[PDB]
Write a protein that binds this ligand. Structure first.
Ligand SMILES: CC(=O)N[C@H]1[C@H]([C@H](O)[C@H](O)CO)O[C@@](OC[C@H]2O[C@@H](O)[C@H](O)[C@@H](O)[C@H]2O)(C(=O)O)C[C@@H]1O
Ligand SMILES: CC(=O)N[C@H]1[C@H]([C@H](O)[C@H](O)CO)O[C@@](OC[C@H]2O[C@@H](O)[C@H](O)[C@@H](O)[C@H]2O)(C(=O)O)C[C@@H]1O
Lengths: 196, 224, 110, 98, 196, 110
């Protein structure tokens, strides 16, 4: 089951023609379809007969009954109004070391002036998503160091324990079956040293 | 559990393969040298190993990319734009030893300074299995032909099967192949670029039917 | 330019280039040529020019810059969100790349 | 500034040195039949210009990757003197630049 | 052959726990032994039944005479004071492009807050050593670019022609059978190429 | 902390890592594990952790990173000057590295 962008992240200023402004990303339907409140927020903000672009489908103004009509990627971009969401959630959870071991890095994703990210996977099952940006983030200064290693573990088939803080939840990935948080540190697995 | 079946991408066709199998370039049965490309290096090829991979997926992507290379060639005006690849299904008996185990073992027998890190990182990423000496027709139980017309975007799959294929229940040998310490001065792990592929595996696939750019994995494992 | 955001898919970055941002001196352009995997050399998506700006004031390497470099050497399929804006790599125009995600598989990348 | 383009060439020589206060790097791009293309890049004076570093790295990776490249060198004011490099492109790994 | 740190390289007060301060290093036996100026400086200032730590041994001064007892690396770090030599000598010579062709970079050295050096060989025998540092040096600017090339030739095992400035002399290496100066240029050259 | 500086020889770094400096956000560690050749797994020298500081204000790579990288990638053995401080990495104490030098032969790495 996928992870659902909390209402709050709804950009009041929608992207124009599928160009979600920087740091924001096109809301998918699987997501809007899942976020009850957002839907509900919509019924009351959507003026009569307006059509809205999404990554997947289109959302028709309540005059049309207000609908999440499916559609192909970036099809709804033909329309001005595009549903975007900011990728950063200030969780409120306390800053602390959480880590998962024996994972690998995969699925590099990169916005424009936002985080570089990756999906750490253990034995096929995706485990967690981590991100690192030199522009925003409680750790924006650790980017340059981390990015360099993120990269090495990426070309090499190297397994690692990854430390992550949950004080920031990242939604750059559309329709995920895993959570994304801020990358705090990587550590090549070393069994003998008792790391993995 | 050890694998039972491995794959091997090759540019040689079934009438050839089904009847003669594959045979290693040479007698150097040194794990590290092969694992690091040294024994498959252009004009230094002598590994007593036939590369295979327990991951079809792996093979599929190499081919999937080799094919694209064609298109991009014709695009520049080098190629005819067509491609023909083969992916052979092989019965991995106890004469196929894992590259992983074998590497990690040669290391915990000679010393961490005796083996280069990436070269083992690489052996894991290829799920390479070392068919020691030769891999006979009897084990090749199938093949998948891949024709592509990059001009018209047509990909054609077709599976022929070996008659000579002998069926028996086997699995790759669990005990790693053990080599003596290398003597060679290895510089780094030679590996073919985009996508990364083992100089043996990537190089044994080519035959007579230009020079392959082999690069040192380490020279770029860390960005410049 | 184009009026809206294209979203290619199963694109592999096939070539990279670094060029000066003819208009602005604090920046330069990282340009590339993505191309839908498999597609016939004839297809429209068999040769897609793109570029993105890199600010020459901040040190280091923008995330896109690191991914572009990682997915290039590894030739991994993406989901480029291209346009709407366009720059001019190779004299001919080229669309600005504004986001890119690796393809997980047929599900997100058809 | 008669600029030129040289495609499907390889980097045969790579070297970083000093040139007065500023430093510069140069490359010999070469094509078998054809001659040598020597192009250099120096400190832009203006400091912040990540350019030199960036362009330098890029060139190193080209050198490193052993790939063909496409260079757009401006023109050398006096014979013998390498031209000033303004554009660098790494040709599809294993293939050629179209 | 050992290059002997000139007398003045020495710190006034030796250092504790074997932790020779930043930018300085443990003095050696084979180096103190070869230094007359030094042995004299020492005895002319060593009181009591005092013994000192040397990277590879001990120095019984004062009432003990001025004896240089052999030893083990870090072994004498047991003591109260280890004699420290400074590594940076402002040679005060001319900025002339001394170059050494056909060399290969080896034996890397690094230390907190100081320089990165390499012993450039040829036929196995050394030739020169050079360093780069972002903190101290005339060519602090050049470090960023130099590290890059240095790294390549190193792992690659690339043969090169190195360029140094003798304006700075370095005593970073223990028992230097060769000199050590400021790295100024590295060239992946073609024999006789005008690029070297 | 530890009493005095330890000088281990014939070490090869087998892991490598990064984490933050629990004291400040202006610095961060760059831990790693080193092993001494010959040392049996019972020996404590077959698993010696360490770390160094990296200033997040000075952008770029320290000479010690640059070396670490090189000697790691290459499995070069080394003379390491660790102590007297201990730092925490992977929830355990690890000896701060202050200087290291690649091993030339037994003549300096016994
Ligand atoms: C945030 C957190 O729970 N971190 C755990 C982590 C996760 O539970 C794990 O990623 C889930 O897969 O587990 C850690 O231990 C490793 C692993 O060891 C197995 O034997 C065990 O069955 C797993 O539950 C898990 O503990 C990890 O780093 O992955 C520890 C960490 O605290
Ligand atoms: C400072 C200086 O003297 N640099 C010399 C250099 C060094 O002496 C050399 O690197 C160490 O031996 O010699 C240079 O010439 C190399 C050249 O020397 C001949 O004598 C020899 O017959 C040749 O084979 C060849 O090695 C050099 O750059 O290496 C000249 C340089 O100015």
């Amino acid at each position: 089951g996928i992870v659902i962008p909390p209402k709050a992240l709804f950009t009041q200023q929608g992207g124009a023609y599928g160009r979600c402004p920087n740091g924001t990303r096109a809301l998918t339907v699987a997501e809007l379809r899942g976020n009850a409140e957002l839907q509900t927020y919509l019924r009351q903000i959507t003026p009569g007969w307006s059509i809205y672009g999404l990554y997947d489908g289109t959302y028709l103004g309540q005059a049309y009954g207000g609908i999440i009509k499916d559609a192909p990627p970036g099809a709804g971009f033909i329309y001005r109004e595009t549903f975007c969401i900011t990728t950063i959630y200030k969780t409120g959870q306390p800053a602390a070391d959480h880590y998962y071991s024996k994972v690998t890095a995969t699925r590099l994703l990169a916005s424009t002036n936002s985080r570089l990210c990756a999906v750490f996977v253990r034995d096929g099952q995706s485990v967690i998503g981590a991100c690192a940006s030199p522009y925003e983030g409680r750790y924006r200064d650790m980017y340059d160091a981390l990015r360099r290693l993120l990269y090495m573990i990426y070309m090499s088939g190297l397994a690692v324990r990854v430390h992550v803080s949950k004080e920031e939840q990242y939604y750059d990935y559309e329709d995920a079956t895993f959570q994304t948080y801020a990358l705090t540190g990587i550590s090549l697995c070393n069994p003998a040293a008792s790391i993995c | 559990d050890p694998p039972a079946t491995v794959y091997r991408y090759d540019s040689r066709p079934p009438e050839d393969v089904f009847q003669n199998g594959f045979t290693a370039w040479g007698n150097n049965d040194n794990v590290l040298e092969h694992l690091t490309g040294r024994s498959c290096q252009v004009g230094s090829s002598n590994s007593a190993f036939v590369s295979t991979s327990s991951s079809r997926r792996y093979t599929e992507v190499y081919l999937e990319h080799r094919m694209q290379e064609a298109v991009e060639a014709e695009r520049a005006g080098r190629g005819t734009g067509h491609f023909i690849g083969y992916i052979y299904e092989v019965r991995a008996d106890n004469n196929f030893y894992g590259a992983a185990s074998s590497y990690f073992e040669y290391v915990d027998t000679y010393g961490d300074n005796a083996g280069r890190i990436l070269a083992g990182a690489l052996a894991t990423y290829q799920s390479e299995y070392l068919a020691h000496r030769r891999i006979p027709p009897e084990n090749i139980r199938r093949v998948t032909r891949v024709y592509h017309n990059g001009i018209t975007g047509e990909t054609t799959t077709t599976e022929y099967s070996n008659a000579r294929y002998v069926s028996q229940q086997t699995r790759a040998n669990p005990n790693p192949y053990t080599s003596r310490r290398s003597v060679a001065s290895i510089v780094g792990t030679l590996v073919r670029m985009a996508p990364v592929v083992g100089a043996c595996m990537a190089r044994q696939a080519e035959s007579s039917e230009e020079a392959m750019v082999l690069v040192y994995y380490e020279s770029i494992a860390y960005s410049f | 330019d184009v009026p809206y955001v294209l979203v290619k898919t199963n694109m592999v970055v096939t070539s990279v280039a670094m060029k000066p941002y003819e208009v602005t001196p604090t920046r330069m352009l990282v340009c590339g040529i993505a191309a839908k995997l498999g597609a016939a050399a004839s297809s429209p998506d068999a040769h897609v020019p793109f570029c993105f700006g890199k600010d020459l004031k901040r040190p280091g390497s923008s995330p896109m810059e690191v991914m572009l470099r990682a997915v290039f050497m590894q030739q991994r399929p993406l989901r480029m969100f291209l346009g709407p804006k366009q720059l001019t790599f190779e004299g001919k125009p080229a669309l600005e790349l504004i986001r890119m995600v690796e393809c997980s598989g047929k599900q997100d990348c058809p | 500034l008669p600029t030129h383009l040289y495609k499907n060439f390889t980097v045969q020589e790579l070297a970083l040195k000093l040139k007065g206060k500023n430093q510069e790097f140069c490359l010999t791009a070469f094509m078998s039949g054809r001659s040598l293309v020597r192009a250099c890049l120096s400190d832009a004076g203006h400091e912040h210009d990540t350019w030199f570093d960036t362009m330098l790295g890029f060139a190193i990776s080209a050198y490193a990757l052993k790939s063909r490249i496409a260079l757009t060198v401006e023109d050398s004011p006096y014979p013998g003197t390498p031209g000033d490099l303004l554009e660098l492109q790494i040709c599809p790994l294993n293939g050629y630049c179209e | 052959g050992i290059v002997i740190p000139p007398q003045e390289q020495i710190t006034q007060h030796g250092s504790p726990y074997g932790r020779c301060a930043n930018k300085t290093r443990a003095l050696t036996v084979a180096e103190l032994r070869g230094s007359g100026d030094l042995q004299e400086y020492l005895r002319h200032v060593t009181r009591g039944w005092s013994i000192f730590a040397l990277y590879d041994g001990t120095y019984l001064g004062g009432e003990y005479g001025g004896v240089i007892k052999d030893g083990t690396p870090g072994g004498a770090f047991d003591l109260k004071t280890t004699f420290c030599i400074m590594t940076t000598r402002n040679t005060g010579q001319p900025a002339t492009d001394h170059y050494y062709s056909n060399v290969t970079a080896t034996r890397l050295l690094s230390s907190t807050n100081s320089r990165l050096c390499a012993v450039f060989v040829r036929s196995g025998q050394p030739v020169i050593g050079a360093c780069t540092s972002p903190y101290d040096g005339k060519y602090w600017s050049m470090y960023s670019r130099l590290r890059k090339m240095l790294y390549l030739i190193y792992v690659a095992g690339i043969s090169v022609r190195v360029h140094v400035s003798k304006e700075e002399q370095y005593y970073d290496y223990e028992d230097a059978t060769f000199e050590t100066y400021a790295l100024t240029g590295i060239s992946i050259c073609n024999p006789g190429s005008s690029l070297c």
